[PDB]
Symmetry: C2
Subunit: 358 residues, 2 copies
């Protein structure tokens, strides 16, 4: 029996896979998949700026995505919203075209399908790009997922396998381990896993130093809409901004990266920045409906790398600090914590993210 | 006597109220009163704007409405016991380059003849009146007797007042005009009918569209779309209604007492569409951030989009139609909130006396 605290994409995912491996699971979260995971664009390109250990974690998660989704859609009988029709990286000036050559050279060694495109061919793949486009890479095996549909499926699956969901705040950690809930009741389990995003470290009762600081990094994000999709595929455009089309006309446009503590106010400043970026690279998007503006807090860590594994406190694990890439990493995270729970050992691929490194 | 008012936006609630004030019996027909252009409107009340340099008739209409605003609000707040949201702490015009500073000298010269309080301000003094302006500000005029109203609060009061005086509100669409009987009337979506001794049409850009209207009776009141946004802070960010012009176009910025900050507006040709667009919102945000750099931090609380009621020559349409006992009051485009009160008087008088006040003659329907 494992108690998972926080039920965003990371903790739902851990909970599901733990169930898949015969364990008994309880998820504690007053509003599951309501925070960063609700707001997230869920883009899944092969890589990004953010280093070699983390790369190996990502590529593995990438390897696993298709099988993870399929296993899930089967259990839940729900769609998860994973699309694999490719990610397009587009560059708009010398400096960003330079970075793309660097990127190609980074990706080929690792058997990631990449296809360089000249300006002409960038425009043929996406007619809606601005003529100022200079070059681009297509990564046809990459794509995007809708985290809203993914977290819904995870819930359905967790339920189907008979995991419990307690929609209450965990107010305190208890020494077997357990948590106290806002309504006075307690939940203990043979293992506790903390996966509460930027609130993880804040839970009262945690022994000093047990969990590192998971600092919020605010991100505003918007969603445009049209009757039929406007953009052909997940598209990332740099001088940057990313643009994730959904099957139903939704078009996600992210993202600001800001340091504002726990604030999730949508600001004239934020929205203008995003709108400027997207209109710059997709001039026809002017008439697209502005359907939603929103703002989430990315879970950070002191060195900006994920925090997975055992704490100094016995039977108390964590799975958090995924910052900009939790949707991408969710599946590997769920395996690695699975194994950890069952075997008690730490898979090689996760060793670099132990908590004890601080 | 009994007048049926069709449409209950600011113009028609206003007409209905004043008509009641003058002893008449009134029925307002509107499925969603004050939900359209009047719901979205910023409600700015500066002394003038661009449409008035050339139209001396419309200027006179506006100035009269201006004269009347304070008395109209007071009479209303009394009857309704509600606040209407009228603030008179001034409108500030600010210029940000040569070309817009030139226009302001022109504006000063336009306004003095007409006994409108204006006070020119150098860059220094612009920044003292509004600390939040960008350093690039060049010059500005203050019009301390001007200001703004919150149309949402105004239209609520009008409703309360209309009720208090016992006017009827029928929350249904008028589907058809009923013509050629001893008295005029409208048919409603639910099959029922309402006749009255007079019908007044005041349905914005829908006015002309009502079925059963004799051809040519009402001119085309073409929709002119406008997107508009509202930012917010706990305490007001801007001291007063502010209109800022730079690099050829402008933006207006209307603070409310409670932190709301209205930012308008796009002028677009999209028929009846009221979609909020990346394009629209970006335009507005750009303009405001340019002239109020600190507004970056402000919450974006609302984005919205209304349809201004136009007319073939862009002037209001008030008075009798060729159809007997059928009047109109519409076509106020960008300035209906400002004109609402004079509109209400002029239509009042018209209803009671049967004659057309001089100030309104230039806006007769028959001019087409
Ligand atoms: C704008 C934006 C765009 C993004 N785009 C992408 C992208 O394109 N691709 C990608 O891979 N990643 C993206 N991410 C990252 C991804 O969403 C995060 O890494 C992800 O949320 C991590 O999941 P989480 O469950 O740790 O955090 P969350 O989703 O924040 O979940 C934390 C959960 O903990 C719960 N909680 C808090 N306190 C308590 C308590 N006391 N008791 C119980 N529960 C509690 C909350 O209710 C919440 O549901 C993006 C993030 C943002 C903000
Ligand atoms: C973005 C924006 C900003 C503005 N800013 C300002 C400003 O600063 N100052 C200013 O003076 N003005 C401003 N205006 C202008 C002012 O809003 C309009 O001129 C005014 O709202 C017009 O009033 P109306 O009552 O004629 O229009 P509306 O309020 O649109 O009247 C139409 C009404 O008729 C009703 N209706 C429609 N069909 C029927 C039917 N068949 N039967 C019954 N009822 C019906 C509708 O339900 C609606 O309530 C602005 C307008 C916009 C769009
Ligand atoms: C390993 C790929 C994970 C993709 C997330 C990429 C996104 C775009 C980028 O950094 O290029 S960051 C999403 C965000 O947190 O705004
Ligand atoms: C004297 C009429 C004042 C109302 C209109 C003022 C606003 C600013 C301007 O035109 O300069 S226009 C409101 C609109 O966007 O329709």
């Amino acid at each position: 029996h494992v108690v998972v605290v926080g039920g965003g994409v990371i903790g739902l995912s851990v909970a599901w896979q733990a169930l898949e491996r015969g364990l008994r699971v309880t998820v504690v979260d007053p509003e599951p998949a309501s925070k960063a995971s609700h707001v997230s664009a869920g883009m899944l390109p092969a890589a990004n700026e953010m280093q070699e250990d983390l790369l190996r974690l990502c590529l593995a998660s990438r390897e696993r995505y298709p099988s993870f989704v399929k296993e899930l859609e089967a259990v839940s009988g729900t769609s998860a919203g994973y699309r694999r029709d490719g990610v397009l990286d587009a560059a708009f000036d010398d400096e960003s075209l330079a970075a793309l050559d660097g990127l190609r050279n980074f990706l080929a060694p690792l058997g990631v399908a990449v296809a360089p495109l000249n300006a002409r061919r960038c425009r043929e793949h996406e007619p809606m790009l601005a003529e100022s486009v200079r070059g681009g890479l297509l990564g046809p095996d990459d794509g995007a997922v809708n985290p809203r549909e993914l977290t819904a499926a995870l819930l359905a699956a967790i339920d189907v396998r008979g995991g419990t969901l307690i929609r209450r705040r965990a107010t305190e950690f208890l020494a077997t381990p357990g948590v106290l809930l806002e309504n006075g009741c307690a939940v203990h389990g043979d293992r506790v896993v903390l996966s509460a995003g930027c609130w993880t470290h804040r839970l009262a009762g945690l022994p000093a130093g047990a969990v590192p600081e998971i600092a919020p990094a605010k991100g505003q994000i918007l969603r445009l809409r049209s009757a039929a999709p406007f953009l052909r595929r997940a598209t990332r455009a740099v001088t940057g901004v990313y643009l994730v089309p959904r099957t139903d006309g939704e078009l996600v446009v992210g993202a600001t990266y800001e340091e504002r503590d726990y604030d999730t106010t949508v600001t004239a400043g934020g929205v203008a920045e995003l709108l400027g970026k997207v209109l710059a690279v997709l001039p026809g998007a002017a008439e697209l409906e502005l359907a939603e503006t929103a703002a989430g807090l990315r879970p950070g860590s002191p060195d900006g790398l994920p925090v997975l594994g055992w704490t100094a406190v016995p039977n108390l694990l964590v799975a958090t600090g995924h910052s900009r890439i939790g949707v991408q990493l969710a599946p590997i995270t769920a395996d690695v914590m699975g194994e950890m729970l069952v075997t008690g050992r730490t898979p090689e691929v996760a060793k670099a993210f132990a908590v004890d490194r601080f």
